[PDB]
Amino acid sequence: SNHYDFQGRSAIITGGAQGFGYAVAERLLQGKAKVVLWDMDDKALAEARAKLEPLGNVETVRVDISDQSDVQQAIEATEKLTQSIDILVHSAGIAGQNNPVADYSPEEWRRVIDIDLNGAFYVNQVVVQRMIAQNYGRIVNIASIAGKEGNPTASAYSAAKAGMIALTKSLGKETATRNIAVNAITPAAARILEQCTQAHIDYMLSKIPRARFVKVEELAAMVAWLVSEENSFTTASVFDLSGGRATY
Known about the structure:
It holds the Pfam family adh_short_C2. The protein is an alpha/beta fold. It has helices spanning 19-30, 42-52, 68-81, 106-134, 145-149, 155-174, 192-195, 198-206, 216-226; strands at residues 10-14, 34-39, 58-62, 87-90, 137-142, 180-187, 237-241. Strands 3-2-1-4-5-6-7 form a seven-stranded parallel sheet, sandwiched between helices.
């Protein structure tokens, strides 16, 4: 196992209460990072803070990342809980409903975009302003293989993840002269799988050369390197986590 030091550093993890956010948070606590979880459910936030308390200093901010004003409120709250805002891991989002484009609910289309794309923009804006002032930042936008491939029956999710990737490239190039790294990850499928049919799981596994889903701890390991001081040159870049699926 490797050790990633985050002593003196403070992290925001959106979608921090569960899944990737939660796995990343546990790993950042293991390296002495000060962690602030951002999530929309106060109850899930309580469960998370209780579990990670033996691991270190964890705080909770309740926020809808699809609401720009709630995001402004979330950032001001974080400033009162932290010495600085060194790291952002934007993990929050929704999968969206599956439907061909011909039958997609425009209402569901707007919602998936608003949360998966506009929210990442709102969260990246308030956080990077603090990184600009500090001349220090390490951001990871958790996107998906859907962002690179345009996954069939998931046009909305695929489009929002793509936007998040291009946002990552604009932001990275804008902050390249400062000591700030803005990178994105493209994982394959990692509780969400309980909804899938066995036939669907075998279709998804057919597309993955690894022949298995990524473990949340594997995502956390890569993200921890990407949010570390040591990731000092690479910016506006996509890191893959698809177990050989991605061809770029």
